[PDB]
Amino acid sequence: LPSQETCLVEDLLYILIGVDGRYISVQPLVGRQSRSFSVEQNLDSSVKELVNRILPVATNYSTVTRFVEENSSFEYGQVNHALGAAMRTLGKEYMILISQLEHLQRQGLLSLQKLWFYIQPTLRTMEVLASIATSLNKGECFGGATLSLLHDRTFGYTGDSQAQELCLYLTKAASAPYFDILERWIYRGIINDPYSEFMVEEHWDQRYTIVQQQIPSFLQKVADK
Amino acid sequence: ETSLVRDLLYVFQGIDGKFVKMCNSENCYKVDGKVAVSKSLKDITSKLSELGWLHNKIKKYTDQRSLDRAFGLVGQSFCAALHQELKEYYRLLSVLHSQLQVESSLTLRRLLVWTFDPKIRLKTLAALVDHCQGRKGGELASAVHAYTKTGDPYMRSLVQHILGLVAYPILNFLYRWIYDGELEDTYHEFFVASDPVVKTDRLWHDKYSLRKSMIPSFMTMDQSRKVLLIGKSINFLHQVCHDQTPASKAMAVGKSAESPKDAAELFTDLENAFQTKIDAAYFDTSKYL
């Protein structure tokens, strides 16, 4: 009855690293948008709510990482693939702080309220990548219109630093591919079309045609220039 | 608790540890045979299931071919990468045992998640291996170039390390055949198979076919006919009673510069600047001829 409070803790920390726990069963579904996790019946109504409170933070990260870490690796190699791999780069250091916490969990020194205050800056870190993760799978957007959406998302966002910090960074690290092949196109002039990444495509001149569904994100005058 | 922590190390290094899992396919599921324990243990046994199985699939591919000298070109240069990112999985396996022993010992959800960064690392090598069952070059160059057209520079940087290494036998066929032209094929790893027809006197007959079924996707169609055009002219100046590399010994300095540039350069395969100075060799070798 005091042991069950640690027995749910060790069950919880394996849920946090995105994998199946001991008695917290995980329900997978296609198009999950934060799949649900089924907790066990327990002996005290207060201690379940504390693991019910940390669980969406474990839920929303583990799902929105999981498909962007795999669908990007399956997909082409456009600006959406350098974007999703940078989410995977940020996901490397998230698993590091959990393991340094487990070095302090060789013997019980923390409880559930100590778990949530430590992951409180990181639950705001994952959840603005969560709204990216829902729209890019409903739309399945193309590379000119991916950066156009991803620009607009980090822009009507204020209120916290470290969420605004990353959601600039990875979109800036998606715009910086775009600017370089723009600079290959405005200086040398060789375009590399893997599949397509631009509004402008080759073919009394009919050499170039523009589509309005692959426009960049900035105001339409610079795309015309 | 900790005995299941000890069991999860041995399937990370390989096949089953404390108990028998009896499955090499579709995931490596831990069977404990206990019902009186909590049902929450079983789902973390199912977290381990696709960690160990996705590790042994990388051992399965490189050991089922069981290294072969036939098609021993670009295929095993792809395997030499496949052992260096096999290597990167093992380095996080050693920090997990230094957590285990005393020098803390309990591994909880911290490392439970630490493990999913190997997972997305191994899923990158899983998508890399599912494309290619064969080890013949040329079609490997259209494989990793189809993986870099995908965006999201997390695994796109990793397959950029592979396209810089898959191409590294491919472009090693090129610039020596531009600079000296001494034929070095055994199984035609390049799309230009040099001398598959018996030697005849030159009636402008095409001995160097370009073979559409093995074209790299970073080399476009006007460049594949271009490197044939320099490779056909470099052989016509060998039998002109001259062994002189075109118009100077500066063609031999160029190969050395390129090999140091490749040495200094991180992993990237150049294709927009690579096609530029072969113009400066193509216009060079044509006027001297």
UniProtKB/Swiss-Prot annotation, chain B:
Record's subcellular location: Cytoplasm, Cytoskeleton, Microtubule organizing center, Centrosome
Subunit structure: Interacts with gamma-tubulin.
Function: Necessary for the recruitment of gamma-tubulin to the centrosome and for the formation of a functional centrosome.
Family membership: Belongs to the TUBGCP family.
Name of protein: Gamma-tubulin complex component 3 homolog
Protein source organism: Xenopus laevis (African clawed frog)
Positions spanned in the full protein: 246 to 544 of 906
